[PDB]
Amino acid sequence: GLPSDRNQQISLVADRATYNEKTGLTTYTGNVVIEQGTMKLQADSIVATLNSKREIQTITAKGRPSKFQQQISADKGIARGEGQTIVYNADTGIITLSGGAYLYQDGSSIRGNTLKYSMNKGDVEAQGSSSNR
């Protein structure tokens, strides 16, 4: 699009970035991050799927480790979500720890099967374990 950048709000930064012409996607690599709020969505690599509106209909993330962080309080700066792969509803602000998952905050962490990330006074309570790879 034309220059408008006095009105930006989201920022991604990448060391290797690629469009995906024959399939509409955009794919990013090299310790990449997308920022807007306390949701510290870094990875190595990000696959942004998008439609006719340039609307980013869903995003997939991966790295070594696979995880993102979040800032919840000035002391509770340390919350995070990890899993076998990560997929993100940019359509509603909710991240999903795909297949098998781990979720951590100060004083608590929970792990097991696939789960959607929480930002309220409620947990997932489902329990198990999963290997690294």
Binding site: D5, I10, L12, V13, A14, A17
Partner: peptide, 16 residues
């Protein structure tokens, strides 16, 4: 609200 696509390797930026 809009997206900034800023580059390492180059110190430049992009949009959609």
């Amino acid at each position: 609200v809009p997206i900034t696509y800023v580059n390492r390797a180059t110190x430049k930026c992009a949009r959609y």
